[PDB]
From a paper:
Nsp14 is a bifunctional enzyme that harbors both 3′-to-5′ ExoN and mRNA cap guanine-N7 methyltransferase (N7-MTase) activities. The N-terminal ExoN domain of nsp14 improves RNA synthesis fidelity by removing misincorporated nucleotides or nucleotide analogs from the nascent RNA, whereas the C-terminal N7-MTase domain is involved in the 5′ capping processes of the viral genomic and subgenomic mRNAs. The ExoN activity of nsp14 is stimulated by nsp10, which binds to the ExoN domain and helps stabilize the architecture of the ExoN active site. However, the efficacy of nucleotide analog inhibitors on coronavirus RdRp is compromised by the presence of the viral nsp14 exoribonuclease (ExoN), an RNA proofreader that is specific to coronaviruses and a few other closely related virus families of the Nidovirales order and crucial to maintain the integrity of their unusually large RNA genome.
To obtain a stable nsp10-nsp14-RNA complex, we substituted MgCl2 with CaCl2 in the reconstitution buffer or introduced an ExoN active-site mutation, E191A, to nsp14. (E) Cryo-EM map and atomic model of the tetrameric form of the SARS-CoV-2 nsp10-nsp14-RNA complex. Unless otherwise indicated, we used the tetramer form of the nsp10-nsp14-RNA complexes for subsequent structural analyses of the ExoN active site and its interactions with RNA substrate because of its higher resolution. As a result, nsp8-like density is not observed along the RNA duplex in the tetramer map. (C) Active-site structure of the SARS-CoV-2 nsp10-nsp14 (E191A)–RNA complex. Mg2+ ions, green spheres. +1CP, –1CP, and two active-site metal ions are superimposed with their cryo-EM densities contoured at 7σ. The shallow SARS-CoV-2 ExoN substrate binding pocket encompasses only base pairs –1 and –2 of the dsRNA, interacting with the RNA backbone through the A1 of nsp10 and K9, W186, and Q245 in nsp14. At the 3′ end of the dsRNA substrate, nsp14 separates the mismatched C-U pair and flips +1UT out of the RNA double helix. As a result, binding in the SARS-CoV-2 ExoN active site is a dsRNA with a 1-nt 3′ overhang comprising +1CP, a substrate structure different from that observed in other RNA virus and proofreading DED/EDh exonucleases and from that previously predicted for SARS-CoV ExoN. F146 at the bottom of the SARS-CoV-2 ExoN substrate binding pocket stacks against the 3′-end unpaired +1CP.
Residue numbers in the entry:
A (entry chain C), B (entry chain G): 1 to 131
C (entry chain H), D (entry chain F), E (entry chain B): 2 to 454, 465 to 523
The structure:
Amino acid sequence: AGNATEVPANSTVLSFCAFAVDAAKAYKDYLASGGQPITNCVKMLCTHTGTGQAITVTPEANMDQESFGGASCCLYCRCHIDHPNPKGFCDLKGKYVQIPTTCANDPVGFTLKNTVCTVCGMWKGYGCSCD
Amino acid sequence: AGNATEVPANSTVLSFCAFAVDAAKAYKDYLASGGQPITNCVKMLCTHTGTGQAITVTPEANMDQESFGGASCCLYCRCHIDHPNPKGFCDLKGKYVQIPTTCANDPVGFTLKNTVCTVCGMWKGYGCSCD
Amino acid sequence: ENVTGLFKDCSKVITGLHPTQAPTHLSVDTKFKTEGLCVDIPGIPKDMTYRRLISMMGFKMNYQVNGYPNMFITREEAIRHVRAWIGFDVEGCHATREAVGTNLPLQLGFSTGVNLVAVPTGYVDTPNNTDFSRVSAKPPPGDQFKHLIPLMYKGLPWNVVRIKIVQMLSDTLKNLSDRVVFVLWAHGFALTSMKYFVKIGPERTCCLCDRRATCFSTASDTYACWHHSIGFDYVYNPFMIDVQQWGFTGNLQSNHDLYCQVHGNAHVASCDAIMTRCLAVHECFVKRVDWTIEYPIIGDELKINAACRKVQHMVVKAALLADKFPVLHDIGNPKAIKCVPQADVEWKFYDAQPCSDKAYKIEELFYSYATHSDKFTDGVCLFWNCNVDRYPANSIVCRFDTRVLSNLNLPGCDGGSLYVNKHAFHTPAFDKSAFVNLKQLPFFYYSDSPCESYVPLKSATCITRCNLGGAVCRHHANEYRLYLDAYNMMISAGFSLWVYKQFDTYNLWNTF
Amino acid sequence: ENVTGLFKDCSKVITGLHPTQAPTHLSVDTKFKTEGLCVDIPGIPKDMTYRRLISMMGFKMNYQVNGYPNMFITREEAIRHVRAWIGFDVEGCHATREAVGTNLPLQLGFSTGVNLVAVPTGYVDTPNNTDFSRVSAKPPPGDQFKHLIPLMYKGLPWNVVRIKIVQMLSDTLKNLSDRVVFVLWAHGFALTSMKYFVKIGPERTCCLCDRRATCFSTASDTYACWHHSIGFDYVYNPFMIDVQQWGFTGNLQSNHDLYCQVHGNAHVASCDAIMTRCLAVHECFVKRVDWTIEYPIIGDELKINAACRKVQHMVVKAALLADKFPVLHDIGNPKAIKCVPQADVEWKFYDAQPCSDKAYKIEELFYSYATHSDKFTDGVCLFWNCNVDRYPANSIVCRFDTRVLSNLNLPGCDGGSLYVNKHAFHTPAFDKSAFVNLKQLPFFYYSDSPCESYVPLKSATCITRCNLGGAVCRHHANEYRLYLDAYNMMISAGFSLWVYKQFDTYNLWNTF
Amino acid sequence: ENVTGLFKDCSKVITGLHPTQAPTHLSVDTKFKTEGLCVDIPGIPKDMTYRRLISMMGFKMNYQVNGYPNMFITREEAIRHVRAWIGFDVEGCHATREAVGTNLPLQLGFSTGVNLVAVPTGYVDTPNNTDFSRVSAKPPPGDQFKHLIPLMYKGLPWNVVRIKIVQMLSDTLKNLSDRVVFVLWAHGFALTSMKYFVKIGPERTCCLCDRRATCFSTASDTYACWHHSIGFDYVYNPFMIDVQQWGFTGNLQSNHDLYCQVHGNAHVASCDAIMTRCLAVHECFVKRVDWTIEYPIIGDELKINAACRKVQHMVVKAALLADKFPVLHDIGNPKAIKCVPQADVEWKFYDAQPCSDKAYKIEELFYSYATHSDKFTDGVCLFWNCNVDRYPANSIVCRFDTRVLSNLNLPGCDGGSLYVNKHAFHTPAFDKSAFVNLKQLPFFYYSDSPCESYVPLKSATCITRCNLGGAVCRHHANEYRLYLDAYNMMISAGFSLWVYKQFDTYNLWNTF
RNA sequence: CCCCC
RNA sequence: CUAUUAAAAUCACC
RNA sequence: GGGGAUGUGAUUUUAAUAG
RNA sequence: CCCCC
RNA sequence: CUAUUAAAAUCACC
RNA sequence: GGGGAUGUGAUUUUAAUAG
Ligand SMILES: [Mg+2]
Ligand SMILES: [Mg+2]
Ligand SMILES: [Mg+2]
Ligand SMILES: [Mg+2]
Ligand SMILES: [Mg+2]
Ligand SMILES: [Zn+2]
Ligand SMILES: [Zn+2]
Ligand SMILES: [Zn+2]
Ligand SMILES: [Zn+2]
Ligand SMILES: [Zn+2]
Ligand SMILES: [Zn+2]
Ligand SMILES: [Zn+2]
Ligand SMILES: [Zn+2]
Ligand SMILES: [Zn+2]
Ligand SMILES: [Zn+2]
Ligand SMILES: [Zn+2]
Ligand SMILES: [Zn+2]
Ligand SMILES: [Zn+2]
């Protein structure tokens, strides 16, 4: 009964962050303690041309970036816990997220540490030039 | 596995006549000792018009007769034992047999007791007039 | 859901038979069925070449016919007809290639010990008749059936197999009984297998003699008893009892191993047959001795149980007048009838259960050497045909050697034996560690009577006042020869005579 | 046509029986039935090897016969006969192989923790008689009956089982009562199980004796009371009461869980019997004590009732002389009776509501340390056999310890106990937490009475003027020994004595 | 990279271990492995609560160390050490819940019928040590292992199990040998089971004694022989031999069934051990006796070998004087040695083929009553310890009864027995049917020798001139007592004496 | 589920 | 309106 | 591969059948 | 098959 | 030609 | 409804991969 969604490589990381008080710090400590990143994300088959905006309604990707389904890159959506956002609404759920390729090994961590510039809509420090 | 052919009302009569040395006398004694006749015969849906020959290749029935599948009215075929016929060939297997309606309660017994006139091909004593 | 596995068509053809050539109403396909009846359709012709295997499984021998004896008998009749119990177990192979859905007898085992492997052979439907033919078969899947794989290439045709069945049963039972009682564990597949070598009918008499006819030949349609059956291929009127119908749980080995340790090797046909017969013998005879059931005399039983009394009288009388014990204790005597009446000794009968004799001088004793070691210290303890764990030093015992298998001593449960003389007693296994305090009684003959009137008796064993002279009288000579024959007949039937180590023939020569 | 489930033919044979050898008209085969009557057809033989299991479910013991006592009694007689209550529950197995449609007693459990496993045994109609024999049976399907699966391989023959039933009932009830009252939850299967070990008949008297006969022997047709029943195998006149007929809906466990948390482990026979007896005890006695019903005297019930007055007179006298209490508060005193007649203290009575003394000397009071803590702070509070949640510090308490089981203290509901001395009091579960403000009362003998002048007593707890000298007088020595025996009898009965923490025997030694 | 199944990590954890606390390089987790070496990553912690089951399957005891004896011995040494053979079979369970990949000894069985059930116990690597602890296990799937299912709920802790192992081995072997030789069928699992109750080491000597040390205690590090091992829990130096390495294909049962029909009940541990030891005994001894290998003397082996010559001298002398036989036929005489040196009879020797006497006085003969019945009709036929199918009527037979088990008669193959006195003879199963033409030989003492002159012998079997008078002389009385003790020793050894039916002691009394 | 193979 | 099967549901027992 | 089955009653209803 | 519900 | 996985078959043990 | 699984080795072959 019911259709499985998860892989056995993701059990330890997803159990440990489901019982955690602060799941962001828990995931960062799990990574800093030699753990393996979260597998089984949805990688879009885009052609790597388009604007490099971070979070969009449709895949918009550069050649140095990749586009994932945003819900699949939110730790609070992967773990099914309360979002720390006001009104408890995921900003990546229902959108596409742009992860730089050098960080594309671990997208769930990337969206935990980086933030977007509100006037540009692209990742601070990686693509944002409005300094 | 396999498709069932027999009914539970026919077990006792068919077991007892399968182990019997003389199955004809065994069936007659089973009938004379209060047993129930052999059920589950193939009754042809004919229109009761035609010549009244006893054993035919096709249903040929009068209004006072009925036509059954001959294999279903041979005790040795119902019990899967050796026929007492020379060369061990059933004469009713592959044919249609004409049972008078007053005996149609028990056809398997009828073909045990009655015989046909070889020059007419109809049941002696019931329909044969060549005296 | 009213159908049977009996005569179930197991072939792999998807459609049924023609209106004709079909045994039953369910054996014709739906293409011809019409308002619960059949209709000849001119297009479809009847199949003229086909082979359909028929499942001879699910027989029910519950017929009541006036002149025909019933195959399945009650427990009381089976108990009365011991010396006809032949255990029976069949191992079976499954039909795999041309038909699926029936089993076939591959190995037939009997409590005699024989195993008969048969070619897998079934009853196939032909358009003209039913043919008894070899079919394709495979051994059962599983690791407890891996010993049946070499048997699929061995095995005789069923003609030789049923002739050997009749030969084995007639060699076993010709001196034991006038019938055969197959002791089955689960009668379904056993009845399936019995279809091959059993043919029943009204009770007939042997040709060539007057005993009950038990075998029947199909070459010449004649019946014979167990003696005159040579070349006969069918067992005419076997009786049988199922033992699972006696309220058991689990398989045969789990129920046999509760009471017996000397049988084993489950799922071999002969060993399963021996287990079945042993379990039935336990369930009917190990409990206690029933004196209401008396068995016929197959041979030399009266001579044996008269020689027992003769030897008992002579031995006890001679031992008493040899050493003059104060008191003897007759342990195990149900009825207070003493062995030697003319004895100047105080007699005390003992039995754990008094056999309803109102003269209650029989004391109550369930003997065991561990607890009753000093129950009787001096005197002698007559242990005639009683079974205890160990006999004390001052004893005189007649034990039955259960390892001597005869027409009167049938194999029993847990190493014991069912000695059937007039009443069937079940004796526990003979253990020679009980006689460590005794020695074997030697042959001797003693007589007090006066005497007078082919060779004269030259023997140092004849203890008589007639023997002191150079010759012996013709009276004690023939009486000695009769007692010698009686003693030989008693010990050859399996009776061991043990006595205390102080016994000797000199104190019998005291009197002369 | 209306039928009943009693004596139902459970066999798997499709046909009926012959006109002869059929017990009723509904058992005859339909070949013979003609116009409401039967016809002897001469050709049909009669079956002689049949075995038909008979359902023993559906007994109705509602007979009215003159000399025969009724098995099912009303709840008033059951209340009057509490020392005989033995709970009873039976688990069953279902006959599976040759007969379907009946259940068989597999495991019998009683209020005493005694579980007896029997072999599955039924009543099988044979053509000569009804055979009480072992039949094929399987445990009930499901998971709450999966503990019954190992019990099919275990089990005892029913003769041994009923011998042990009678032995255990006799050891339990020989000193309590002259009868047994089986406390059944649902009597449908318990009446079926009673067919195996219970007889009935007119009221008889024990042989060797004059007590009511409760056991019956089948070896010799003799009757016996609970004392002389050795080797007796049948319960002769058991009484019983069904608790589900007291207005109960739901399971037994669902109704026992409302009032008790001590028992559990449902569907084990002895545990269900304990649950049934506990539920009956709760329904009958937990509500309110009845002084109308009295009970006979087992033994030591007049010595205990005198010892608990010899003690109540002493400790309430000594506690008032040693402390000079100005006021007393007697909580729970049903009658306007003083423990000591003369006392300088002023007395005050309390109880729940005036117990048959409508004079206004006794006040109504419901005491509880949560609400009534600081109202009686002055003086002492004499709690004699009044069970409250916590006693105050200024108390002289006698409290029955319900953890001491005896001939007089039967097990009760929710950890309490039914102490039945003359009248039945149900006392709640003992807890030491109610005595945190008190200490135990030390044993002492106080005597101020005049004196007269022979083993010398050299104990120092004897507070009297004769002990101030070297030797105690013969009058106070034997009186001390009487009081010591009474005190030991009282504290062995299960009564615990408590006193305020400042109690000491020094002030008793001072007034002299 | 080649690996082995020994010490295999059976746990279900997907990762490996830290560089520390990993026993080998193949156990380190792949995070740390770099260039064939490991790297200490400081951020990664070490697991401190892990429990990893370790597979004890795959031991290879092929070491060559100077002071340490080898466990696995060649078949020549095993043949030389037959009195120590104890068969050994172990059934196992499979670890199921937290670790998969190993089997655990559940039931240990020996040639003696001793089955020992143990709790499933393994070696679990913990971060501090290896814990010998109980682990989750399930019985093997299938039907031939369904009898092991009730054994998981039974079982003993392994300390009790090895205490009982040492106790049973000591009670079995203390009088036979100074070592134990485990006869294994397939040593793969028996070596795993031996890790639990077997130590090894250099050869030690028993404390309190001077015999080889076979047991070792862990409470105090002391060693003991089979006599002084009380409370010892380890077998110190067991030897063993694998029978499957003797060129065998197929099951153990498939190979035991070829030569023996007595044992059975496969996959029960003690039954499989009995089968293994029986198969080894058949392969080593049933073929042909070897006079090259001798055996040490347990006890009473020189008294028996002298008694069976004291008796063979007497009965063959008395049987030739009492009958005056013209010719003798010695069947089975390996050497040209006469039982009596001087005799008027003419002697003839026979054996199978000339046994180390190449002189032509001994003929070669294979005897069998079916073929060699009527060739030696004249004279007597002395069968001294020659086992044929049936002896002729004119015979003096001494036959070893293989049903008597003793320190000298070990169990053998196919109901026979291995009688090991000085040399090992395997004798076939005893049957009384070979003595139908003979009777037992009565005890008698014959003496014709000169005489000299103190308890008087009053037995009448003493055939000598001193017994013709009133009192027997002191010379023949003590000689009679010596011969009686020798005869009783011989018949307690298990030897049965038979003689022709016309034998009588009368003619012995006549020559005087 | 139980029994048989 | 009464009785008889069949089915379903609920309840208690196993 | 072969079977044998799947326990005891009570009370409401629903359709019917018979009266 | 075993455990949990 | 050597080694390493994967699969299949057979065999022995449980 | 939820899982967890389905033991130990040995020898031949078959494809491959690497050398
Ligand atoms: Mg079998
Ligand atoms: Mg109940
Ligand atoms: Mg219950
Ligand atoms: Mg083995
Ligand atoms: Mg084994
Ligand atoms: Zn989210
Ligand atoms: Zn910006
Ligand atoms: Zn036919
Ligand atoms: Zn005609
Ligand atoms: Zn004859
Ligand atoms: Zn047996
Ligand atoms: Zn005489
Ligand atoms: Zn009494
Ligand atoms: Zn309770
Ligand atoms: Zn005084
Ligand atoms: Zn020692
Ligand atoms: Zn053997
Ligand atoms: Zn002498």
